[PDB]
Design an enzyme around this catalytic site. Structure first.
Site, short mmCIF file in Angstrom:
data_model
loop_
_atom_site.label_atom_id
_atom_site.label_comp_id
_atom_site.label_asym_id
_atom_site.label_seq_id
_atom_site.Cartn_x
_atom_site.Cartn_y
_atom_site.Cartn_z
N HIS A 41 5.75 -0.90 0.70
CA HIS A 41 4.27 -1.64 0.99
C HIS A 41 4.65 -3.27 1.42
O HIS A 41 3.67 -4.06 1.62
CB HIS A 41 4.03 -1.91 -0.60
CG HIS A 41 3.51 -0.69 -1.04
ND1 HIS A 41 4.40 0.18 -1.96
CD2 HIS A 41 2.57 0.35 -0.91
CE1 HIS A 41 3.82 1.21 -2.28
NE2 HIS A 41 2.66 1.27 -1.79
N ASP A 85 9.12 4.50 -1.93
CA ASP A 85 8.68 3.16 -1.81
C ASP A 85 9.81 2.67 -0.84
O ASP A 85 10.59 1.56 -1.17
CB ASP A 85 8.61 2.44 -2.96
CG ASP A 85 7.99 1.00 -2.57
OD1 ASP A 85 7.63 0.71 -1.63
OD2 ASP A 85 7.91 0.41 -3.72
N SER A 179 10.66 -7.61 -3.78
CA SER A 179 10.44 -6.34 -3.32
C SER A 179 11.01 -5.99 -1.89
O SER A 179 11.24 -6.93 -0.86
CB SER A 179 8.96 -6.01 -3.07
OG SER A 179 8.41 -7.34 -2.47
C1 LIG Z 1 4.76 -12.90 1.29
C2 LIG Z 1 4.51 -12.39 -0.35
N1 LIG Z 1 5.25 -11.23 -0.48
C3 LIG Z 1 4.84 -10.15 -1.24
O1 LIG Z 1 3.66 -10.30 -1.91
C4 LIG Z 1 5.50 -9.09 -1.24
C5 LIG Z 1 5.15 -8.22 0.08
C6 LIG Z 1 4.26 -6.98 -0.26
C7 LIG Z 1 5.15 -5.95 -0.55
C8 LIG Z 1 4.50 -6.61 -1.64
N2 LIG Z 1 5.05 -7.86 -2.17
C9 LIG Z 1 5.50 -8.14 -3.26
O2 LIG Z 1 6.31 -8.95 -3.92
C10 LIG Z 1 5.32 -7.04 -4.25
N3 LIG Z 1 5.88 -7.16 -5.58
N4 LIG Z 1 7.02 -6.57 -6.01
C11 LIG Z 1 7.35 -6.88 -7.24
C12 LIG Z 1 8.50 -6.59 -8.17
N5 LIG Z 1 9.10 -5.53 -7.57
O3 LIG Z 1 8.64 -7.12 -9.26
C13 LIG Z 1 6.38 -7.81 -7.77
C14 LIG Z 1 5.81 -8.50 -8.78
C15 LIG Z 1 4.66 -9.12 -8.77
N6 LIG Z 1 3.59 -9.18 -7.75
C16 LIG Z 1 4.07 -8.54 -6.37
C17 LIG Z 1 5.25 -7.67 -6.74
C18 LIG Z 1 4.88 -13.67 -1.36
C19 LIG Z 1 3.87 -14.21 -2.12
C20 LIG Z 1 4.33 -15.26 -3.07
C21 LIG Z 1 5.75 -15.57 -3.12
C22 LIG Z 1 6.80 -14.81 -2.41
CL1 LIG Z 1 8.43 -15.29 -2.19
C23 LIG Z 1 6.38 -14.00 -1.39
F1 LIG Z 1 7.23 -13.35 -0.62
#
Ligand SMILES: C[C@@H](NC(=O)[C@@H]1C[C@H]2C[C@H]2N1C(=O)Cn1nc(C(N)=O)c2ccncc21)c1cccc(Cl)c1F
EC number: 3.4.21.46
Length: 225
Positions: A41, A85, A179
Site C-alpha cells: 500500500h 502486502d 510500513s
Molecule cells: C508519507 C506517509 N507515509 C505513509 O502514510 C505510509 C505510506 C502508505 C502505506 C501507508 N503508510 C503508512 O504508514 C501505513 N501505516 N502502517 C502502519 C503500521 N504498520 O503501523 C500505520 C499505523 C498508522 N497509520 C498508518 C500506518 C507519512 C506520513 C506521516 C509521517 C511519516 Cl514518517 C510518513 F511516512
C-alpha cells in the site's frame, strides 16, 4: 517507530527509505542488488529508493538515491486488506554495495519462529502521538507474538493468517511511515511491516508483519524477471 531509539548509523545497511518526490513514504529492505522489498500500500508521483542513509536530510557519503525502473505491488493485494502486502521495487540499476549498503538475506523456511523471538524493526516512521517525524533512523527490539494470542478476540480477532505474524506493540511499536520496513530476526529478514493503517503502541493491538517465507515464490519470480 514509537518508543524506540535512534539506530546506530549504517548498522543496518539493508535499510531503505522509499520516497515519493524526495519525501519519505515507507521503509524498505534491500533484498537483491537491484531490488527493494516493501509493502503493497506504500504506492503517478516519482518513486525513489534511498540507500545507505541514516539521516533523510543530511549529506552522508554512503547516501545514494536510486530511481525505480519498476514497482511491482503484489498482484493479489487489495486496498482495504493487509493480505499479500508486499511491493518489490526494481532499482534503475544495481545498487553500489559497500559497508553501508548491503542486501539482507530473507527467510525461506515457511515455519514460525519461536514465541518471543526478539526481532528488530527500524524505520523513519512517526515517533509520538502528535505525529513527530524523525530525521534519523529509529529502531526497536520487539518480541514475536504467537499467532494464537494475536488472533484472540481482544486482539486481532482471527485476522492474522499463516502468512502474517505479529510482534508486541506495548508502547514500543512500528507506526505510520514504518510500513514496508524490515522485521529482522536471527539476522535474517523475517517479516515486512504491513502498510494498512493500524493503532500504534497499544499492547492489545499487536504489530503485524508479512511473512516473507510465505511469499518466496512471488519474491523469487519477481526478482528473476
Ligand atoms: C508519507 C506517509 N507515509 C505513509 O502514510 C505510509 C505510506 C502508505 C502505506 C501507508 N503508510 C503508512 O504508514 C501505513 N501505516 N502502517 C502502519 C503500521 N504498520 O503501523 C500505520 C499505523 C498508522 N497509520 C498508518 C500506518 C507519512 C506520513 C506521516 C509521517 C511519516 Cl514518517 C510518513 F511516512
Amino acid at each position: 517507530i514509537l518508543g524506540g531509539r535512534e539506530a546506530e548509523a549504517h548498522a543496518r545497511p539493508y535499510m531503505a527509505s522509499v520516497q515519493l518526490n524526495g519525501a519519505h513514504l515507507c521503509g524498505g529492505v534491500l533484498v537483491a542488488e537491484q531490488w527493494v522489498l516493501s509493502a503493497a500500500h506504500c504506492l503517478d508521483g516519482k518513486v525513489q529508493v534511498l540507500l545507505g542513509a541514516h539521516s533523510l536530510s543530511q549529506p552522508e557519503p554512503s547516501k545514494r538515491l536510486y530511481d525505480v525502473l519498476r514497482a511491482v505491488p503484489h498482484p493479489d493485494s487489495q486496498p482495504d486488506t493487509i493480505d499479500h502486502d508486499l511491493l518489490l521495487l526494481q532499482l534503475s540499476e544495481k545498487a553500489t554495495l559497500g559497508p553501508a549498503v548491503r542486501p539482507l538475506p530473507w527467510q525461506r523456511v515457511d515455519r514460525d519462529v519461536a514465541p518471543g523471538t526478539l526481532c528488530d524493526v527500524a524505520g523513519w516512521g512517526i515517533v509520538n502521538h502528535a505525529g513527530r517525524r524523525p530525521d534519523s533512523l529509529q529502531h526497536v527490539l520487539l518480541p514475536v507474538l504467537d499467532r494464537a494470542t494475536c488472533n484472540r478476540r481482544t486482539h486481532h480477532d482471527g485476522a492474522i493468517t499463516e502468512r502474517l505474524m505479529c510482534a508486541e506493540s506495548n508502547r514500543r511499536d512500528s507506526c505510520k511511515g514504518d510500513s514496508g520496513g524490515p522485521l529482522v530476526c536471527g539476522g535474517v529478514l523475517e517479516g515486512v511491516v504491513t502498510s494498512g493503517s493500524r493503532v500504534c503502541g497499544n499492547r492489545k493491538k499487536p504489530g503485524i508483519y508479512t511473512r516473507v517465507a510465505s511469499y518466496a515464490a512471488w519474491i523469487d519470480s519477481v526478482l528473476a524477471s
